[PDB]
Amino acid sequence: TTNFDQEALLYHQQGKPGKIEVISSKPCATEKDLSLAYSPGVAAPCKAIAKDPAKVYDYTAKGNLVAVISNGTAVLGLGNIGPAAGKPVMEGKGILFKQFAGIDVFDIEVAATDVDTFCNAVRVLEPTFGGINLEDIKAPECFEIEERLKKEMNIPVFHDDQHGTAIVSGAALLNACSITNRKMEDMRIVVNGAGASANSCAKIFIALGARRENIIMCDSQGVIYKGRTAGMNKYKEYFASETEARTLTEALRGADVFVGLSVAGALTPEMLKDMAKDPIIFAMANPEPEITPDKARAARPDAIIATGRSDYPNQVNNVLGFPSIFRGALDTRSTQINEEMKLAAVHALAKLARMGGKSFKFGRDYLIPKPFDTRVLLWVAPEVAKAAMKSGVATRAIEDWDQYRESLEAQQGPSKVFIRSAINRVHQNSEANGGELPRIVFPEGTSTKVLKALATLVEERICQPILLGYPERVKEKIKALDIPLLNDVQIVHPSSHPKYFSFVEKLYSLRQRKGINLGEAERLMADPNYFAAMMVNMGEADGMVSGSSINYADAVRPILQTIGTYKEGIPAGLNFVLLEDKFLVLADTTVNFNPSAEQCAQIALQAAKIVEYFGIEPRVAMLSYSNFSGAEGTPRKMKKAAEIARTLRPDLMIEGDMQADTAVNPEIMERLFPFSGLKGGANVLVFPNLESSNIAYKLIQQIGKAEVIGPFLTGVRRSANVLQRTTTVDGIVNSVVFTALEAQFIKDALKAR
Amino acid sequence: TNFDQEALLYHQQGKPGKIEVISSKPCATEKDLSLAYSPGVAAPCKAIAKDPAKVYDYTAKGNLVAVISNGTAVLGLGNIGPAAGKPVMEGKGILFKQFAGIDVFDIEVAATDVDTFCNAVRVLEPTFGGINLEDIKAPECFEIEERLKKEMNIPVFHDDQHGTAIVSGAALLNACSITNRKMEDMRIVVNGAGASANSCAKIFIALGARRENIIMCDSQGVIYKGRTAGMNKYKEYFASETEARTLTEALRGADVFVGLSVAGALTPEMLKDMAKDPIIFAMANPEPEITPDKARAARPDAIIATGRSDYPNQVNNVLGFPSIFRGALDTRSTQINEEMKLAAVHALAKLARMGGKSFKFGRDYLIPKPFDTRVLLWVAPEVAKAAMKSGVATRAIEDWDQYRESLEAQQGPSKVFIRSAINRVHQNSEANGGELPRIVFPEGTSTKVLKALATLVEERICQPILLGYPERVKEKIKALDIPLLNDVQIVHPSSHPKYFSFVEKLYSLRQRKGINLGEAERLMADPNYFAAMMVNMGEADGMVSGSSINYADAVRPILQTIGTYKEGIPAGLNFVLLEDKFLVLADTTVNFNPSAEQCAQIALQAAKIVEYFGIEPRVAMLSYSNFSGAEGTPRKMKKAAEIARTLRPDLMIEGDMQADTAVNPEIMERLFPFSGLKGGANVLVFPNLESSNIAYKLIQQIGKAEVIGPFLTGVRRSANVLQRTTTVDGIVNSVVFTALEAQFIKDALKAR
Ligand SMILES: CC(=O)SCCNC(=O)CCNC(=O)[C@H](O)C(C)(C)COP(=O)(O)OP(=O)(O)OC[C@H]1O[C@@H](n2cnc3c(N)ncnc32)[C@H](O)[C@@H]1OP(=O)(O)O
Ligand SMILES: CC(=O)SCCNC(=O)CCNC(=O)[C@H](O)C(C)(C)COP(=O)(O)OP(=O)(O)OC[C@H]1O[C@@H](n2cnc3c(N)ncnc32)[C@H](O)[C@@H]1OP(=O)(O)O
Ligand SMILES: CC(=O)SCCNC(=O)CCNC(=O)[C@H](O)C(C)(C)COP(=O)(O)OP(=O)(O)OC[C@H]1O[C@@H](n2cnc3c(N)ncnc32)[C@H](O)[C@@H]1OP(=O)(O)O
Ligand SMILES: CC(=O)SCCNC(=O)CCNC(=O)[C@H](O)C(C)(C)COP(=O)(O)OP(=O)(O)OC[C@H]1O[C@@H](n2cnc3c(N)ncnc32)[C@H](O)[C@@H]1OP(=O)(O)O
Ligand SMILES: NC(=O)c1ccc[n+]([C@@H]2O[C@H](COP(=O)([O-])OP(=O)(O)OC[C@H]3O[C@@H](n4cnc5c(N)ncnc54)[C@H](OP(=O)(O)O)[C@@H]3O)[C@@H](O)[C@H]2O)c1
Ligand SMILES: NC(=O)c1ccc[n+]([C@@H]2O[C@H](COP(=O)([O-])OP(=O)(O)OC[C@H]3O[C@@H](n4cnc5c(N)ncnc54)[C@H](OP(=O)(O)O)[C@@H]3O)[C@@H](O)[C@H]2O)c1
């Protein structure tokens, strides 16, 4: 097993067994609350439901809970493994459910291998569950089970295989047809394979506007022809086309859309020559796609390529369809899931792809929205609800949409989507630039944490790393760590680069009158930190990430000495604390020992600019130990800093001084100090000295369940970032992601000048 | 209906459910998605293919029970349907999680028929690691229990019958063993041997009783031979030899009276006719069967242990199912065995028989209070012993020390710290003749203070001496509609009989510090100064203030009047109660910029409090550098750590560190293995006021941990100052700990 395999194995091993747990929604520790929960004060909701049964949806979590039910017979690529071993997949499905829609998930791995036991056992769980997701059931049992369940149950039932990927496939097909200006009246599709996904795709395409005679079904044995005596399954013979294309090679003559859903290797360049004008190719059977996009473009440049892998664009992911469907169904309190909801979802996905703080560009490489696009939910969950306003079988029938919009936004706070949006923005910036990752120089080439994070960063295509150090030693360390992904990395020895002496001359010219001459300049450039700073300054790299193996002072001194600050800029750290519904920005945590009022105001302005880059209105607060006291010492300095920042940036909302609770709690400020101009809480917090900010952010990172990312060195001319020496692998990954974002922004700003 | 509306908020409150499901493992990134979803999620699956039992090592099956039901008998109500019973099942689940740390699902089976219910629960076997099916109808409960025990391996447990049996046996064994009678030969009569009483009688006969040695008289008369009224196939398991039918003749009141059903049937004439030492268990209906006062008045020589929460000797299921099911789960036990039931009842009896002290085992402490922390820590290991002895646990058994460590970790400070503080307050009050500490509140006309005082006086913690106008505060109390405050003591500072003596003593204290008789008379009108003088002169045990005014103006009179003891420095002490440990931040209120000696003294004081709370203190002098010793704060922190080490050479106090290095053992061991601090630091000493204040306030607000404080340490007497931005529950916690400190200081002053 590789390093990733071992990490995945230990993912469910370390700490508490499993991944999911059940906790009280609100705190319950007091004896009065315990009596409210144990003494017969909890019988009152039962009596309330007694007079109104359906009202239970508002009297419990049933309306916000989804079953995830499987028998362990179609677990990914494992085939039949039994319900016992199908538990971690259900846990992962529930994790994805909560991540992408915010719905509580109950994973039930029922041991009903027989169809009758499944049907007569699932039906009895109806009154206590708000919706069921069937999955991981092998054919042909799954089709019959779902068909019986849909009629025999009065609450929505969804199958991730019978109505799963086919929604994203239909959205991609709609976008491809719009690109090719071809209507659904005369379209040719050959759905290779005879699995659940193939039949689901065929059914939804037929219900979408395709003609059943035009479409054909192909499998391992061959194309189902008229009067076929092989494959006596009812579902297989249902999608039987009267033709003579049993041969695989000749079955694709004049094929408008490949939509291939068979194992890898079923497509060849000679086979690719058999497609019709402007064909569309779909991958299948991860992790090996049906055909590589590069060879498809080389052989047939007029074609359109869609894949099921993260590496190549146009990723068909099953996570785009189910979470929004279920969120819309439950919030609208729908009593069933019909084809109208799925068609509405397909239309919404196609519309979103056709048309944080930015988006992609419509084209041949963007037919469906990326799975990391949060707006997906906001653009398809209401639409399903819209279908619930027309199709029917839905109670409640919410009359508002903005309230629904903000309710949906409440379930996608920064703690869930901030890093995902940052990585998506990095990908958008790289792809819009031609497809080159920013060059990030790592002075610590022989650092275990840096290399272990570089494996993930290279796999995720975030940055192009340039490790500094002796090539032999870093290669030995990579081989010892067993990372078969950094073997092709670029390693640059400091005193071997062709531009090394140019860097020495540049540093000598910069600081000739600051205590450095040629003899000292060469020795300084021998250091990896100074060489990395010079590389970043001179344009040989976009950014740099150092300080993992040394203290912050001697890791940030070369950056300030070489790269320096820009006009009217002060170097300053900056941390993002990603809470449930907001992210706070603490500044500064790393550089300034005891900033004055002017320095505090400048730090506040820099932090506000960084916040505004992310599309969030900044509200600065000058933290202190006193609430608008203005007394001698820190309160006076914070008051003066707030006034200076207000004069510099009048349109903002700055106020000081105040304590942390007054700043970050709008209710406290409104109740106690209604005169202050800061309304709604503060997302930017400027600290009086270094000890306060450093200790506060480290304590929040350690003992607080919230996640902090940083510190990021702001106020420097180029994109230089220093990691805290106590960082972890994930901290390095996040910091490198945001360093790549900053480097791309700085490079784009430089170019557009 | 706000009590129901509280759960309706729990059902809306930006959260539409009483319970919710979160992810213990992180899920925020594409790598995390690959780890949790396909194709990475296939990697553990192939691991489980070799051995199915490895699910207990991979998935959350081990810590997963369910409250299965059908709504046939839900709480104090008859048949209601599976749909309408969900809130009570969710309450059972949250009780499970709170008192045992067990994740629990809420499944309702919409089937009154036995066959479908049994089929569904049997087929849910690999889904769940344990079954706590509860609130099903009877006597079909016996049938479903037997069928499920015979069908699948995982332990099926009916909470009602067996938990009632365990609690009844625990209350009965100690009572019988102290009444000069035996539970095996002396003819006990009891009341009931059916449904839950059937399990009660089975537990009794397993604990010494029998069918022939013990004559059983039922709640529904008697289930002996003859009369066939209200008979079923599962009732004659305890036929007796008494041949009478009427309660007067069938029941002669021989040894005990354990009623579990039917309305109140206990007459004073019958209690007089009872032979000797009436042991009465009158849980029965949701409503009390017979009130304990009437039964006690009927027989003065009677020892009555009712089964209601309104009276002492409480009987509850929280001493039953949680600990025993935790024990069964931890060993991956197969099915449910009687031996574990007798082990649990013996553990409860021993715990009942054997902070500062505990309530005397007499007529009031037959069983401990049904929320005590030691209950689980005692019952669960014994249930594990029984499960191992019965040979039903497939999983191997390790040393019991690690098991006890895990059981203790199941209930960290965040769940039990305030409750244990309240219990210690009550124990100190009981050990002091029932007197409560007198706490004087300078702000007698503060809405938050009065609202918190309602709960504080309802919980019997402190005695308010609210200062201010005797009429204005009464008007405020009437406006806020708090009845319990109608009997509190209101003192006008300028009209108290001891006002002039206090003025004279204040003038004597600070005659050479800018205060003369006129200025002392002017200052004693201040409620803060008067409360401080009251505490200093012993007329009140403690005081809390600052809920409306800023900290400086609220703490200056305390420092000027009460002062600091020898070798003491005033400091603010905050407790951050995390899931596994509690940190102590100091100082957060007073010292603008303490020096090395001041920081060392603050650390010593904080270590003293931590030692008082029964935890080994580990001190860390926080800074922005990691053992750098550079000019400025790092050098001051290093010097302070050295001074504190020389002062108390038995604690582990380590240099200057960042917060992450201090509170994380892994970072400390990996980066700085040359240090003397091991296992993390539970005491943090900050270099200045801004750092500590901002850190504690930010942790309180944006963190998910509970911060209680700040507490004023280093003063001669008990006197705390609340934060201006405090809430009602914060005031409640601060007053609880102020009362605890006042009791400790009064006890210290009583001697010498
Ligand atoms: C995540 C963590 O680990 S946080 C740890 C806490 N932080 C620390 O321990 C480090 C705190 N900072 C410091 O100790 C220092 O201020 C350092 C390391 C930034 C600089 O060391 P110093 O001896 O003060 O300065 P140094 O000689 O390196 O100065 C380098 C350059 O920075 C510039 N500089 C430093 N601070 C500032 C500032 N606030 N504004 C503008 N320029 C500045 C100087 O002008 C100088 O430029 P020059 O070469 O043209 O003269
Ligand atoms: C994306 C995130 O997460 S952070 C988002 C932050 N949002 C913002 O709006 C950031 C605000 N702006 C900034 O931080 C910066 O000032 C930026 C991004 C505008 C970049 O400013 P820069 O382009 O680096 O300024 P710079 O001073 O280098 O450019 C002016 C010229 O002076 C030159 N120059 C100035 N000082 C020096 C020096 N010491 N040595 C050499 N050249 C110098 C530069 O080479 C440049 O010349 P060029 O354009 O021919 O190459
Ligand atoms: C929870 C929150 O909101 S925390 C808010 C942040 N904290 C604050 O704003 C308050 C910080 N503390 C202070 O400002 C001051 O130190 C105060 C208010 C406590 C008192 O300091 P001063 O106002 O200078 O005191 P003052 O001159 O009135 O004397 C008061 C007494 O306190 C004593 N005292 C004050 N600080 C100390 C100390 N660190 N050690 C010993 N004694 C002390 C003085 O000796 C004096 O006693 P004395 O009259 O017998 O000589
Ligand atoms: C419980 C928690 O959570 S925190 C745990 C840790 N807490 C602590 O350590 C708090 C410490 N608080 C205390 O009171 C200390 O334990 C003590 C008892 C040692 C302090 O002693 P003090 O309160 O200073 O009193 P002291 O020992 O001086 O009293 C002896 C005599 O001096 C007299 N006295 C002392 N100071 C004065 C004064 N200013 N004016 C008049 N008489 C005085 C007392 O009247 C007493 O006389 P008596 O024998 O006739 O009764
Ligand atoms: N969007 C996605 O990335 C996505 C979504 C869902 C599922 N999946 C993948 O789908 C798989 C599970 O579902 P499935 O229905 O695809 O399983 P599957 O039915 O086993 O997939 C292959 C089947 O297609 C037929 N087939 C056609 N041409 C074939 C050929 N040349 N070689 C072999 N078989 C050929 C065979 O069926 P006959 O023997 O009956 O002819 C074969 O059993 C997993 O790999 C899962 O990851 C991917
Ligand atoms: N130890 C505990 O914490 C504990 C235990 C149990 C109950 N309670 C409390 O008691 C309430 C629940 O009541 P419950 O009925 O489930 O438990 P219960 O009153 O202790 O059980 C008595 C059972 O006997 C039967 N019975 C026979 N005659 C009866 C009569 N006249 N009235 C009532 N029942 C009669 C009923 O079963 P049939 O309907 O099958 O005859 C009933 O379920 C809740 O408030 C709950 O909190 C607490």
Residue numbers in the entry:
A (entry chain F): 11 to 365, 376 to 773
B (entry chain E): 12 to 365, 376 to 773
Give verbatim lines from the article.
While reducing NAD(P)+ to NAD(P)H, MEs catalyze the oxidative decarboxylation of the TCA cycle intermediate L-malate to produce the TCA carbon source pyruvate and a byproduct carbon dioxide (CO2) in the presence of divalent metal ions such as a magnesium (Mg2+) ion. The hybrid-type MEs consist of an N-terminal catalytic domain (ME domain) and a C-terminal activity regulating domain. The PTA domain does not possess an enzymatic activity of PTA but acts as an allosteric modulator of catalysis; that is, binding of some metabolites to the PTA domain increases or decreases the enzymatic activity. Binding of acetyl-CoA to the PTA domain is known to reduce the catalytic activity of several hybrid-type MEs.
We determined the structure of BbMaeBacetyl-CoA at 3.18 Å resolution. The binding site 1 is the same as where acetyl-CoA is found in the crystal structure of BbMaeB-HD.
